[PDB]
Amino acid sequence: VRYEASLRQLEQRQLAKSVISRVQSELGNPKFQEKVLQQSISEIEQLLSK
Amino acid sequence: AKSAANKLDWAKVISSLRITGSTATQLSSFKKRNDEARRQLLELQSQPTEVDFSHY
Amino acid sequence: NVIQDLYLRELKDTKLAPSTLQDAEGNVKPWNPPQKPNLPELELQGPEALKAYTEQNVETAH
Amino acid sequence: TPITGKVTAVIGAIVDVHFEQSELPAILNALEIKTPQGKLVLEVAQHLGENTVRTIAMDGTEGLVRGEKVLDTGGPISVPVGRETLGRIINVIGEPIDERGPIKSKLRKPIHADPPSFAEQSTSAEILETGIKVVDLLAPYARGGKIGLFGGAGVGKTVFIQELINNIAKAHGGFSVFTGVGERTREGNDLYREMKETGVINLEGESKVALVFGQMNEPPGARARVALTGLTIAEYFRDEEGQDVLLFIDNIFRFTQAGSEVSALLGRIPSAVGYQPTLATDMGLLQERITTTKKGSVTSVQAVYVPADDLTDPAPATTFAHLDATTVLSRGISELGIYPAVDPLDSKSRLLDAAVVGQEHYDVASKVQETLQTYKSLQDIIAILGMDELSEQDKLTVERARKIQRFLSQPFAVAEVFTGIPGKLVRLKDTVASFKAVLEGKYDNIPEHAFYMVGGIEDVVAKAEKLAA
Amino acid sequence: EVSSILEERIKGVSDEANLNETGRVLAVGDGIARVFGLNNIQAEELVEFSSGVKGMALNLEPGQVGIVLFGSDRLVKEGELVKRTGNIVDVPVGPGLLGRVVDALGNPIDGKGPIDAAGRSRAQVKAPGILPRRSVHEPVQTGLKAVDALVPIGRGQRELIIGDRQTGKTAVALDTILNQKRWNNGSDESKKLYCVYVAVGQKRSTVAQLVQTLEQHDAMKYSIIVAATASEAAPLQYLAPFTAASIGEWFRDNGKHALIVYDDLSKQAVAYRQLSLLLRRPPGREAYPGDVFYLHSRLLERAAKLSEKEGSGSLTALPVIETQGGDVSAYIPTNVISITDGQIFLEAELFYKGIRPAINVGLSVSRVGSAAQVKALKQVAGSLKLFLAQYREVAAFAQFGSDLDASTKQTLVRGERLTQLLKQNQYSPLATEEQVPLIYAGVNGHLDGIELSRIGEFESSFLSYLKSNHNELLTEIREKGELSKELLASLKSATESFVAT
């Protein structure tokens, strides 16, 4: 049980740094450009809803 | 239970006052109490005979 | 949005991190084998005891 | 980053900069002021806004002209670590102050680091024999243990440490760190020379010891992160090299002391007895960074120059919070000629117990304590009256306590020279045996002086023969 | 698996709304920020710094609102916005904390993962009234005979454990928990104290040793360990008892009985000292600003033996102030002494004297109850006090070794045996059914004769003898809990039976 739990934790931290790698990948893309537009239109939608 | 045995033993101790000079009968009786208490501590120590095969 | 981007990218590109069963073996252990308690020793066995005790028995507790 | 700035103020060594550009620094960043005195390292400690920071100055101050460029070198200062830092004496910037030329290293690491978590802990304490009877009896050492000395004004705090290093650290093959905070240069020269001589530093060879030495003269701010630098070296060994570690710290009163000086200047109301309100966080942080993990259980030895010998002063008090053993040493007991000079009713260890060192050990120690406490109690009666006006039973106790006290006088090894008497080091197994007999008064019938300044029970006997002659 | 849990986590974030509060950090450094703006700020509210730091706000000023950081300095940056959580500090409170170490903010730091807390509550809940109290009648037995006899502990009662630092300071409290294992093992829920051990200012290693001891004694199950480690922030240290209190109040409210050990409040006081002086508040007496009394009093008065209406649920408190040099005249020790319903003075000299536990019984008092101890035990230890009281005077005469009156030296002889009887090795408590005999023997003077050296030998043997023969007697003491005439006589006969022989 102890190693099984350890393996889940190990799996989680390995997959955590793999998540960090995907975050670094997203911020490289001109999704970095395109999501500014997404945030802009989202602020238009939100703030018009305000 | 164990107390029946021991009440008769200690009754025999105060009877043994009248016939004292059996020096290893009394050590055997002390032992019978000891080892009776040993099995008693063993059987009271007794864990389950198995794992929690349901839950654990 | 960013939730979706991360969700998609992350999930797709690695859902679980790889695992190694072999490594578990060192850190875990199987059942330890019984000691075979058998039949206990026989108490005050043989007439070796009996003859000894009859002969010994002459001590009157005065 | 190239955050240009000016030195708006130089109020002491708590320089205030005005970063001209509105580019923001961050707390615990490091800055280089480039001067004909080379680089000067400052560490951002407040942002007072308007891009006007207030900065701790590590290196020396003088010559500064207001309106002097700053450049932000960011983050915590990066020390150099690796096995190739083993044997060096390190400043704080990684410079070899033993001048072995630029410290060869693998990975260079930030001075500041996080304290390992509750989960990261793996706390274990063994037995460690110091070869000193009083230490073994009253406070059995342990691996990963936290030892504390609350000795005098380096009256033999240093001597005690040197003996411990001589025994334990040359009986420990694993890495060991000496970090000497705000201590006198001569001690460093003696230590360095001794280390090189005793091959613990093989100069050409490799060393199983590393050394950090911070001189008292050096500005307070430097002394504050001398410790932090050392903690990084220790962490590299503990973690990255994985190897068994030890650490020695002396004088950690200076660590506290340095902090209290800057605190007032920083603009923080200095709490009771002038000591910083942030005393607790710093002591805590240091002792939670030095902590027993599965990565390595770090034996730490801390030496507090108790200020005027007041242990109720907040700085010794907060040290007690993070220790597992103490061996408070009384200056008075040094004067009585007892070397070791450790107060024996003010020694404790978590590893002194009736099963951690056995019931027999615990009983033996108990009786020693009880006997001595009685003797201390009868100090009044003895003085106002006499010892012939004491009860016979008590007179035996008193004679026993006097003998025990004298037995505790056991010559020093490194300071075999300094005391002038050949060191007496005695095994733990031997100690338990020796005290058991003495308590049973089996050897209480031979000169009190025979017990004085010697090792084991056999040695007392031999010195009785010497006295007899 | 881990993927599934993560998939749930990813799913668990999406969408947010306009932030109607802001303020721009200015001061930053000294770990206490002061931010400009924030007018919507409700006092004591929790404010999320955009760094990711959360800091509650304890000082409001029409300039710069003083938000005490929980998080790191470097993460905070000048000019950052802080957006109000909009919630005054709250902790999850429930029964899921049973068998859990938690940090101040209620995060399982033992990493037994999430807590099944049945609510969240606020840490500023005020102490119940006169009307919500009921008369105290709930004994608590620590397994240390001296405590029960001399300073009997009820429930909803404050007993201040005071004395020199780490003289097994932790260990005295742990002993209580261990004899309270017997009631816990016992299925009477209202006699099951869910024990909450609060550890303030202590290092992770010390705590790790404590949790190891508790898990070893498998008392951890009903124990909750609330922690504010040496590392943990000064605001969090201040907040730690008050959120510990909230967890306790959930038991208390439910009608369940529980016990809260506040170890050590002396380090809490230092934390508030730091906190206040970096809120720039004027130093109090000994640099603890006056209203520290107010702070402590509101905390302490939440230990209450509540009315039958409230299910009789009584949270019991044991404050612990580790007095440095026994300095009780120190502002915080003076303050606490007044608040608390008992003081349990311990003394280092008596530790050195070999009395372990080392209790300065002269200043150890329990001003409240005697239904705070067993009726049987009240009868036997009635003159334990008298003998000891006589012993104190007698001991003074005995000192200077002047030729004592034979009567005084009778007292002295009796008294000494009692002292040896009291001593107990740490982590070994004693069941009350078998503390009544030992005290009976001593008080009925049968031990007075028995020599001091072999009192310890005698004690052990006596217990063994009672286990063998007069185990019927023990069962009766357990069953009826008040010594009847028959029990006193039976016990007298038994005691005689083993005192002689």
Curated annotation (Swiss-Prot), chain A:
Coiled coil: none annotated. It comes from the Eukaryota. Transmembrane segments: none annotated. It is found in: Mitochondrion; Mitochondrion inner membrane. Present with 12900 molecules/cell in log phase SD medium. F-type ATPases have 2 components, CF(1) - the catalytic core - and CF(0) - the membrane proton channel. In yeast, the dimeric form of ATP synthase consists of 17 polypeptides: alpha, beta, gamma, delta, epsilon, 4 (B), 5 (OSCP), 6 (A), 8, 9 (C), d, E (Tim11), f, g, h, i/j and k. Belongs to the eukaryotic ATPase B chain family. Mitochondrial membrane ATP synthase (F(1)F(0) ATP synthase or Complex V) produces ATP from ADP in the presence of a proton gradient across the membrane which is generated by electron transport complexes of the respiratory chain. F-type ATPases consist of two structural domains, F(1) - containing the extramembraneous catalytic core, and F(0) - containing the membrane proton channel, linked together by a central stalk and a peripheral stalk. During catalysis, ATP synthesis in the catalytic domain of F(1) is coupled via a rotary mechanism of the central stalk subunits to proton translocation. This is ATP synthase subunit 4, mitochondrial. It comes from Saccharomyces cerevisiae (strain ATCC 204508 / S288c) (Baker's yeast). The chain holds residues 193 to 242 of 244 of the full protein.
From Swiss-Prot, chain C:
The keyword Mitochondrion applies. It is found in: Mitochondrion; Mitochondrion inner membrane. GO terms for cellular component: mitochondrial inner membrane; mitochondrion; proton-transporting ATP synthase complex. It comes from the Eukaryota. Signal peptide: none annotated. Its main location: mitochondrion. Coiled coil: none annotated. One of its GO terms (biological process) is mitochondrial proton-transporting ATP synthase complex assembly. The keyword Metal-binding does not apply. Keywords: ATP synthesis, CF(0), Hydrogen ion transport, Ion transport, Membrane, Mitochondrion, Mitochondrion inner membrane, Transit peptide, Transport. Mitochondrial membrane ATP synthase (F(1)F(0) ATP synthase or Complex V) produces ATP from ADP in the presence of a proton gradient across the membrane which is generated by electron transport complexes of the respiratory chain. F-type ATPases consist of two structural domains, F(1) - containing the extramembraneous catalytic core and F(0) - containing the membrane proton channel, linked together by a central stalk and a peripheral stalk. During catalysis, ATP synthesis in the catalytic domain of F(1) is coupled via a rotary mechanism of the central stalk subunits to proton translocation. Present with 6140 molecules/cell in log phase SD medium. Belongs to the ATPase h subunit family. This is ATP synthase subunit H, mitochondrial. The gene is ATP14.
From Swiss-Prot, chain D:
SUPFAM superfamilies: C-terminal domain of alpha and beta subunits of F1 ATP synthase (SSF47917), N-terminal domain of alpha and beta subunits of F1 ATP synthase (SSF50615), P-loop containing nucleoside triphosphate hydrolases (SSF52540). Its EC number is 7.1.2.2. The keyword Phosphoprotein applies. The modification Phosphothreonine is found at residues 73, 198. It comes from the Eukaryota. It catalyses: ATP + H2O + 4 H(+)(in) = ADP + phosphate + 5 H(+)(out). Pfam families: ATP-synt_ab, ATP-synt_ab_N, ATP-synt_VA_C. GO terms for molecular function: ATP binding; ATP hydrolysis activity; proton-transporting ATP synthase activity, rotational mechanism; proton-transporting ATPase activity, rotational mechanism. GO terms for cellular component: cytosol; mitochondrial inner membrane; mitochondrial intermembrane space; mitochondrion; proton-transporting ATP synthase complex. Its main location: mitochondrion. It is found in: Mitochondrion; Mitochondrion inner membrane. The keyword Nucleotide-binding applies. ATP binds at residues 151-158. Keywords: ATP synthesis, ATP-binding, CF(1), Hydrogen ion transport, Ion transport, Membrane, Mitochondrion, Mitochondrion inner membrane, Nucleotide-binding, Phosphoprotein, Transit peptide, Translocase, Transport. The modification Phosphoserine is found at residue 334. One of its GO terms (biological process) is proton motive force-driven ATP synthesis. Present with 164000 molecules/cell in log phase SD medium. F-type ATPases have 2 components, CF(1) - the catalytic core - and CF(0) - the membrane proton channel. CF(1) has five subunits: alpha(3), beta(3), gamma(1), delta(1), epsilon(1). CF(0) has three main subunits: a, b and c.
Curated annotation (Swiss-Prot), chain E:
The record marks 364 as: Required for activity. It is found in: Mitochondrion inner membrane. Keywords: ATP synthesis, ATP-binding, CF(1), Hydrogen ion transport, Ion transport, Membrane, Mitochondrion, Mitochondrion inner membrane, Nucleotide-binding, Phosphoprotein, Transit peptide, Transport. SUPFAM superfamilies: C-terminal domain of alpha and beta subunits of F1 ATP synthase (SSF47917), N-terminal domain of alpha and beta subunits of F1 ATP synthase (SSF50615), P-loop containing nucleoside triphosphate hydrolases (SSF52540). One of its GO terms (cellular component) is mitochondrial inner membrane. One of its GO terms (molecular function) is ATP binding. InterPro entries: ATP_synth_asu-like_sf, ATP_synth_asu_C, ATP_synth_asu_C_sf, ATP_synth_F1_a_nt-bd_dom, ATP_synth_F1_asu, ATPase_a/bsu_AS, ATPase_F1/V1/A1_a/bsu_N, ATPase_F1/V1/A1_a/bsu_N_sf. Changing residue 340 to I: In ATP1-1; growth-defect. Its main location: mitochondrion. One of its GO terms (biological process) is proton motive force-driven ATP synthesis. Disulfide bonds: none annotated. Present with 41500 molecules/cell in log phase SD medium. Belongs to the ATPase alpha/beta chains family. This is ATP synthase subunit alpha, mitochondrial. It comes from Saccharomyces cerevisiae (strain ATCC 204508 / S288c). The lineage of its organism: Eukaryota, Fungi, Dikarya, Ascomycota, Saccharomycotina. The gene is ATP1.
